[PDB]
Amino acid sequence: EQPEPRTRRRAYLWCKEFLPGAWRGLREDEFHISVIRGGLSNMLFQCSLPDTTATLGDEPRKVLLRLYGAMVLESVMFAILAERSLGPKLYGIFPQGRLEQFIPSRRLDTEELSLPDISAEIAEKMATFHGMKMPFNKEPKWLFGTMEKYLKEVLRIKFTEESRIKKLHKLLSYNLPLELENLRSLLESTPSPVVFCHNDCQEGNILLLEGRENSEKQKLMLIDFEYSSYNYRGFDIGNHFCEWMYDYSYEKYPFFRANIRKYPTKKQQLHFISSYLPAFQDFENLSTEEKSIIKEEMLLEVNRFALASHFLWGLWSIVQAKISSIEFGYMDYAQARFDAYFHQKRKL
Amino acid sequence: EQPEPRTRRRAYLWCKEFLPGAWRGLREDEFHISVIRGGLSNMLFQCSLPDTTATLGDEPRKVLLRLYGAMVLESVMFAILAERSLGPKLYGIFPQGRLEQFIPSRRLDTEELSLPDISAEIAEKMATFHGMKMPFNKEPKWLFGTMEKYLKEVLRIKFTEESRIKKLHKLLSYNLPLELENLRSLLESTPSPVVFCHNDCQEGNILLLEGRENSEKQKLMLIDFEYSSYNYRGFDIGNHFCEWMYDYSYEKYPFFRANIRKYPTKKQQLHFISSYLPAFQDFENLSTEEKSIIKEEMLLEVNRFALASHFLWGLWSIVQAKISSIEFGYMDYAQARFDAYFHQKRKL
Ligand SMILES: c1ccc(C[n+]2ccc(N3CCCC3)cc2)cc1
Numbered sequence A, B: 001e002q003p004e005p006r007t008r009r010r011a012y013l014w015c016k017e018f019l020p021g022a023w024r025g026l027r028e029d030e031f032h033i034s035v036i037r038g039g040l041s042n043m044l045f046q047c048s049l050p051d052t053t054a055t056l057g058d059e060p061r062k063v064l065l066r067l068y069g070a071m072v073l074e075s076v077m078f079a080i081l082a083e084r085s086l087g088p089k090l091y092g093i094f095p096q097g098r099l100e101q102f103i104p105s106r107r108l109d110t111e112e113l114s115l116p117d118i119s120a121e122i123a124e125k126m127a128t129f130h131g132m133k134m135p136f137n138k139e140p141k142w143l144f145g146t147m148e149k150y151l152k153e154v155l156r157i158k159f160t161e162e163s164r165i166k167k168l169h170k171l172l173s174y175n176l177p178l179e180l181e182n183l184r185s186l187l188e189s190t191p192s193p194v195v196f197c198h199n200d201c202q203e204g205n206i207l208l209l210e211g212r213e214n215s216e217k218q219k220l221m222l223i224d225f226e227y228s229s230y231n232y233r234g235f236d237i238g239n240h241f242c243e244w245m246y247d248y249s250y251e252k253y254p255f256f257r258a259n260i261r262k263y264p265t266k267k268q269q270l271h272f273i274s275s276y277l278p279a280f281q282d283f284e285n286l287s288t289e290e291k292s293i294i295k296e297e298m299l300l301e302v303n304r305f306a307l308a309s310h311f312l313w314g315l316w317s318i319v320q321a322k323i324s325s326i327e328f329g330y331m332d333y334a335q336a337r338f339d340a341y342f343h344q345k346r347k348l
């Protein structure tokens, strides 16, 4: 798929001006670009030298253009992860977007999250992410700060369309401000270390790296850290466990499938935190008693913070139903997160 | 010097929230802060743990707070230089400023720039800076782009003070638009490689590192990359040579000294580019003949680009005389840069 002419022009000039070697002397007529993801927001394009053009130096042959269609924090963070080889390289930054390394890969599918070696490697990559120093606010205000902002916005919302009006009345009927305070009191009493969290560790943000599919422990990269913050570790892991239940590749309305039965079993959760803990702290030398206590208390921690994954994404999704024009059943998704919230409360 | 109460409060909270280990549990009453530089713009403060407080990990004991009083590019650049150990570590970033490693040091004095070992190390540090890949526009539009912006602003300016009105009329009498085109024709005929330039390599932006004063080749750090861009190498070197003539530490009006005789001699220029060239490009393995040809070519290049240092800082200084409330003789400095411009033209 070719982009619109204005985009091809701007993309050609960004590549020509920001990228070194063969890019600097490239003509408009030699520029290869194709759409990876369309939309009004966060469009992706592959940009490439001709197969016949030789590289002068170490410049890449293809790059990813990301157009926007908080910017400071996200840009600094992307640049830092690039310097530490924990993200794609940053080739160019300008007001309208970035040029990034193109990483030959695909996203994981929902069903791949439960494969033991995939799950063990996500746990190791998340533990690594959790351990790094970032120049951002270390006070864990992100979680309840964000839920309070969305709740405020949710209580102001008026839909005009019938089906959206009825769905919102059902969600509002739960008394979301009271439920939020009950959730705060539970998590206030749930110790969880503050770490640098991805905050959106789903299959769509996990690369299966082409040519590494036979590697047991090094075939993945976590990407798209735009929601990242210092946050309770319990949130990041609980949120990941929730994502086992949601498949965003469903091609008919509401453009997701939810399956409560797909949440990881205690066995699958122990397999994940058993990879996470050695990678985060050594831990393997502790007594079996201490290891068991730590794991059991961590299962409780992540399953409780899983409630905040449901609550935050539920509220987020109601706001998107108002402000987003993306083809997605936001209100149905909100209801699915709240069904899972009350089911998880009953399970606990 | 102690800051204002409001500032002490905000500084305490930034350090407490952004810095790890002992900072996280620090009380207001344990907070040590003192002013390094006042002003309406770019205030600096030292912030410190008590001498009695032990560090829990590898957190710093003291840090520099920088308050502002372009932001994306400058923040990403600072973060990248920190990651590569070419600038101070970045401990925190927020809308009002940054935290930053405290580097025990002082600035060089103008007179130190001509010390052979100081000059050789500035040349090596600038060569290193010139060699690095940065995610910025590589098209060298910065130099004439900036001079055209300042010239446009200079031609709009009306002063209300009589002495400033007369000083501007003399500067305007040179026919700055014609002189800019004479400069364009000279520099368009002068090859100079495009490199990542500091653009402001003066003594005030060169740290003498405390405890390294006996190191021959590693006692300096270049700082304050706020004006950095891809630019003609000739500008960065020519600009540095011009800064041998200007002392900004003079305590009486106009708060600088200018001395045309302090420009580096051919010998001192060859000493600098003799350190620069091996550190930038390999060059070491060329014959004596090839080295001499390249050096003589480079003396031409850098002395011509020196004219653009005079012209750009001259125009900049007229604009600052309008908009800046810093106590400095901006119009006298402008006249000094234009005197040096016409003197350098006559010399060439
Ligand atoms: C642009 C943005 C989003 C989509 C579709 N989509 C995919 C995943 C979505 N979610 C993942 C996080 C919870 C909701 C929401 C919407 C398609 C294009």
Ligand SMILES: c1ccc(C[n+]2ccc(N3CCCC3)cc2)cc1
Binding pocket: B200, B202, B248, B255, B313, B326, B328
């Ligand atoms: C702090 C801030 C400003 C000043 C004085 N000053 C110093 C240097 C200036 N220049 C920057 C390099 C060329 C002109 C301009 C003004 C002195 C101390």
